[PDB]
């Protein structure tokens, strides 16, 4: 009808979703209220301006921001000088989602740059001459797979990579992030991701890893960084995704996990928070919402008959609304929340999350929801690797041609 | 000696005591990608760091240089590793180093390297005496700092410093009963000390949680904790729970109270309760109220729960197709 508002966040009843602090103010409620007030202004902006809302993904703007950043960054990025392969990955993946081609000049330059970052003893460091570390190793491999050329694939020294992973493996099943470094669930996911993509998984490489990851699931249903710690979206994505790669999702109580992640979507804002009682943040559009495609596949693999055949178990529309209305920088790039400055990390994850929210896929069944203008639709992303599903297939197929190091 | 922010700070290339060393520029290749346009100060320090690292110069000057490299990018794990190599080779006083890491963490508390460095120091010294108080100071600035809580759990567990933690948890819960990190710490302390099997402890916990729930019915943390500690043994195993929750319905409702009721029914139906029929309907009704009115952001989840319950608890669920 004429009075009907198609945008969920703008409907009159949506106002009922505002925080109820029970007249007991604490730091948590105060902070939450500030965010909601700020976001309510964004929602109400169309109304106060007397304009018809139009949700447009600023592609040209995002593209310019990305294409330039792929070549040069201001000193604002000095804090990421030990994470350059991540800059390559975040940017290339964002471009891939936006369906922007990667010029062969660019692709070859990225390849050569990543080679310089590759350690003589396996793995990639944060920049040339830096010691190898699992986080930039994961990023570098993903970046090379997005490129997907023979050159890209050939950059990876598979034998040394496997040697590197073994040098980090711990007796309790976990992995250090780097030599003399910390241990947390990120390492399990980073190792499993690169080892699976490059076909270097030996029989004992991940021995005890699934169990170690399962010990990270806590009373909340989610997964913490290490056993005993608070459940967090970043670590939960890492844990579940690694378990999916190792085909051991069953080790987890998938039911409490599903209840936990679904509870992480903010009723008012529409985006996701990283942990209970904290604030909404656009990057969790991926870390948190990305868990739904994973859970759907896990539960479906167990023959769960009650699974929807057209939607993920989260409010796809509300997440898209949050991202499109609150997470776009006018000059290009995406962000955490209104008031935050853009960065390539949030650009990569807000877009990744948007793609997840727009596309439902379950074998033969396929259903899209594209809020706003049709041009808003992005290329799909693989829920485990967060690179194009085609890149995943292409890479795995290619590496399966090689024998697992050792033979 | 010379702070990175000192008004009289001088670039390394202009320091006499460094004249013998040729700085090593970054090897970015002929046509760089993601090239960072570093400031003068940054590039100068790092060119000298690259030099000392490359020649593995384990010297006092190299040691002081790492402090600057760290202040420029505390996330540079390669610098932290070299610094730890220097601490051992140069036989540096580790308490002095503890003083240093305390200051660094105070200024950049959301960094993985600084907390890992402090941990290594504590391990080396086998001294946890300053930990709980240090962490408490950080938690006093950000009561939810993830690294702080994780380091705290490690110290407590490794050195068995359980004695006063529940008291600390009670203190923070009083300051902010919505602090999920504190509820998680509460569970950590209890499960590693008395455990929740002890009926007196469980009882105490549930009483406490229900009391917090009454004071702030919309605080999701108390709700998650209550479910967290009872769901293991099975919600149906506690008959009085349901009644008591229904009693809050009038003056303390929330999508949480309703969601919990569904969890209780769900388990009741799982442990073949009486009036299987009556229970299932009560549940599907709440699932609908949730997906349709009280908690629509989770409509896809609630619809799924409704279909799941129906799928295996309807009177027809056990009836053969031909009937």
């Amino acid at each position: 009808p004429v009075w009907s508002e198609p945008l969920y966040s703008l409907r009159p009843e949506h106002a009922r979703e505002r925080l109820q602090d029970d007249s007991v103010e604490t730091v948590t409620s105060i902070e939450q209220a500030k965010v909601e007030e700020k976001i309510q202004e964004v929602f109400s902006s169309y109304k106060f301006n007397h304009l018809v809302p139009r949700l447009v993904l600023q592609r040209e703007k995002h593209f310019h921001y990305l294409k330039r950043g792929l070549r040069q960054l201001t000193d604002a990025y000095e804090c990421l000088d030990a994470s350059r392969p991540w800059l390559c990955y975040w940017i290339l993946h964002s471009l891939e989602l936006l369906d922007e081609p990667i010029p062969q000049i660019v692709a070859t330059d990225v390849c050569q740059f990543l080679e310089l970052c590759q350690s003589p003893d396996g793995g990639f460091g944060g920049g040339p001459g830096q010691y190898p570390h699992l986080a930039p190793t994961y990023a570098a491999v993903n970046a090379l797979c997005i490129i997907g050329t023979e050159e890209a694939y050939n950059v990876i020294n598979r034998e040394k990579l496997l040697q590197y992973l073994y040098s980090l493996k711990q007796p309790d099943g976990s992995f250090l992030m780097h030599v003399g470094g910390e241990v947390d669930v990120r390492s399990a996911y980073c190792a499993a991701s690169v080892a699976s993509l490059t076909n270097i998984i030996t029989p004992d490489l991940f021995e005890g890893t699934a169990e170690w990851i399962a010990r990270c699931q806590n009373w909340e249903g989610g997964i913490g960084g290490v056993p005993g710690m608070e459940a967090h979206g970043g670590y939960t994505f890492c844990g579940l995704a690694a378990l999916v790669i190792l085909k051991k999702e069953r080790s987890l109580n998938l039911k409490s996990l599903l209840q936990w992640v679904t509870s992480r979507q903010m009723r008012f804002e529409g985006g996701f928070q990283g942990r209970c009682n904290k604030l909404v943040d656009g990057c969790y559009s991926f870390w948190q919402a990305g868990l739904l495609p994973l859970l759907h596949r896990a539960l479906h693999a167990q023959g769960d008959p009650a699974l929807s055949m057209s939607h993920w178990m989260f409010h796809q529309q509300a997440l898209q609304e949050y991202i499109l209305m609150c997470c776009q920088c006018p000059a290009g790039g995406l962000l955490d929340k209104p008031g935050k400055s853009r960065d390539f990390y949030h650009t990569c994850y807000c877009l990744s999350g948007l793609s997840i929210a727009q596309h439902f896929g379950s074998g033969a069944m396929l259903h899209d929801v594209v809020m706003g203008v049709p041009e808003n639709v992005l290329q799909p992303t693989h829920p485990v690797y967060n690179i194009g599903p085609d890149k995943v297939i292409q890479a795995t197929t290619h590496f399966l041609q090689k024998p697992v190091p050792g033979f | 000696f010379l702070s990175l922010d000192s008004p009289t700070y001088v670039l390394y290339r202009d320091r006499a005591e460094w004249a013998d060393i040729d700085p090593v520029p970054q090897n970015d290749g002929p046509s760089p990608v993601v090239q960072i346009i570093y400031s003068e100060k940054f590039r100068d320090v790092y060119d000298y760091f690259r030099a000392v690292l490359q020649r593995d110069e384990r010297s006092e000057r190299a040691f002081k240089l790492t402090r600057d490299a760290i202040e420029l990018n505390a996330a540079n794990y390669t610098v932290w590793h070299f610094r730890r190599v220097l601490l051992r080779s140069l036989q540096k006083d580790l308490q002095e180093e503890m003083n240093y890491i305390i200051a660094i963490i105070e200024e950049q508390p959301k960094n993985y390297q600084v907390w890992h460095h402090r941990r290594v120091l504590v391990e080396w010294l086998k001294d946890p005496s300053q930990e709980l108080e240090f962490i408490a100071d950080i938690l006093n600035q950000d009561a939810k700092n993830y690294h702080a809580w994780q380091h705290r759990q490690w110290v407590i567990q490794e050195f068995r410093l359980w004695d006063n933690e529940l008291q600390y948890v009670d203190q923070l819960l009083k300051e902010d009963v919505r602090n999920n990190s504190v509820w998680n710490q509460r569970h950590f302390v209890i499960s590693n000390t008395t455990g929740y099997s002890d009926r007196a402890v469980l009882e105490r916990e549930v009483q406490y949680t229900l009391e917090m729930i009454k004071l702030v019915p919309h605080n999701e943390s108390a709700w998650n904790y209550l479910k967290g500690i009872l769901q293991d043994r099975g919600l149906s195993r506690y008959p009085n729970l349901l009644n008591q929750l229904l009693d809050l319905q009038p003056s303390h409702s929330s999508p949480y109270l309703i969601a919990f009721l569904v969890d209780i029914y769900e388990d009741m139906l799982e442990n073949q309760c009486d009036n299987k029929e009556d229970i299932l309907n009560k549940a599907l009704e709440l699932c609908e109220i949730l997906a349709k009115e009280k908690d629509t952001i989770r409509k896809e989840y609630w619809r799924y729960i409704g279909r799941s319950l129906q799928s295996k608890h309807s009177r027809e669920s056990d009836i053969p197709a031909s009937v």
């Binding site: 994470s83 991540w86 570390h133 986080a135 930039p136 992030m177 990120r186 970043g234 990283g274 943040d281 990057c283 969790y284 955490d336 990390y345 | 996330a75 959301k110 960094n111 993985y112």
Partner: peptide, 4 residues
């Protein structure tokens, strides 16, 4: 948030 943080990541590494």
């Amino acid at each position: 948030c943080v990541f590494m």
